[PDB]
Amino acid sequence: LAPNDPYYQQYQWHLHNATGGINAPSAWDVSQGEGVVVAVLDTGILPQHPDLVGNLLEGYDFISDAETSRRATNDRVPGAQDYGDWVENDNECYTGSVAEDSSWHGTHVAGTVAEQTNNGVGMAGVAHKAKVLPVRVLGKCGGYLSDIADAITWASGGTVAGVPANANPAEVINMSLGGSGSCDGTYQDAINGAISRGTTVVVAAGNETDNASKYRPASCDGVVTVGATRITGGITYYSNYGSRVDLSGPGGGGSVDGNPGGYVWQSGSDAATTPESGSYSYMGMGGTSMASPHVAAVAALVQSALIAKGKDPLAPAAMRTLLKETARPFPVSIPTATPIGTGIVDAKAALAKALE
Ligand SMILES: *C(=O)[C@H](Cc1ccccc1)NC(=O)[C@H](CC(C)C)NC(=O)[C@@H](NC(=O)N[C@@H](Cc1ccccc1)C(=O)O)[C@@H]1CCN=C(N)N1
Ligand SMILES: [Ca+2]
DSSP, rough: OOOTTTTHHHHHHHHHHHTTOHHHHHHHHTOOTOOEEEEEEOOOOTTTTTTTTSSSSSOOOOOOOOOTTTTSSOOOOOSSSSOOOOBBBBBBTTTTTOOOOOOOHHHHHHHHHHHHOOOSSSSSOTTTSSSEEEEEEETTTTEEEEHHHHHHHTTTOOTTSSSOOOOOOSSSEEEOOOSSSOSSSHHHHHHHHHHHHEEEEEEEOSSSBBGGEEEETOOOOOSEEEEEOOSSSBSSSSSOOOOTTOEEEEEOOGGGGGGGTTTTTEEEEEOOSSSSGEEEEEEEEEEEHHHHHHHHHOOOHHHHHHHHTTOOOHHHHHHHHHHHOOOOOEEEEETTTOOOOSSSSHHHHHHHHEEE
């Protein structure tokens, strides 16, 4: 499928480039992810972006701190509107932090997952007939472990005190987020709960040019940990590495690969602070955060294709194995001290093996 989205051909190398893309054109001849729900646990969403509307579920906002969520109370509430995660001043988030503009990070990630495609508008998405379940866990200066843990529980169909039952449990959770430290205790348990309910959990490896074993959820047991590659097919300058990394997706090399080749391109906004301060746009961003949803969406394509043929969904372990086994080997040597998994997720190869 060669979709008609106006910026697809020039900007979206991560979809269709021969050394650094995920083989999406060929994959889309087989599956577009119809029938699956992917939970995007992130900064929230711009729910009326014209290139996403139609693919979104209402979702929920798990941030329990008014100052972080920018909402009127410390309550968690239905809907996942991103209020904007801008930080006005240096050092507000930690000693040494730098002021910056709103990210609209969750809208970009949701775009990779399910941006409306072949619609004559903007860009394309990977599992573009799936639905995104946006679950807002990150706000000003980030978010809180216990909000992130409960979000995993709910998104995967478990029960959380104080939140109504999830009518749309997700086959796949994407967490383009993390912090330093040991998985485990609260985090590992929430994750184990999602796995026991059949949900595949896909996370970013992190961006510290460091061992993924030192960050969470990158180092948790039972997740698919995703490193980041360049348009070239080689490691990005920032990608974490190490034996916990299972495979990689396109994250964008940054300035060394220029514009657009250094960046992943999707739905977002140019707003500096609040949604109203700007307007719907398409943004280029780089990180393991952009690689992770390519893999999450391939998982969605696979579940969808299985259900369409009347076959059983893969359990989480089988899904991770399939994604690793079918990854395309890197077209550029990876240094043995910085391994980033078996290869770059290959949407078509994963489909072909799952349907054999
Ligand atoms: C996209 O490339 C990155 C992926 C990533 C993976 C691993 C480690 C860090 C980052 N995604 C992001 O940076 C998220 C979106 C944008 C930057 C706007 N933001 C965060 O990940 C966010 N993390 C955060 O708030 N962590 C706190 C809660 C927590 C505790 C334990 C485990 C997981 C999360 C924390 O206390 O660590 C952001 C970046 C990393 N650090 C902070 N504080 N904020
Ligand atoms: Ca589009």
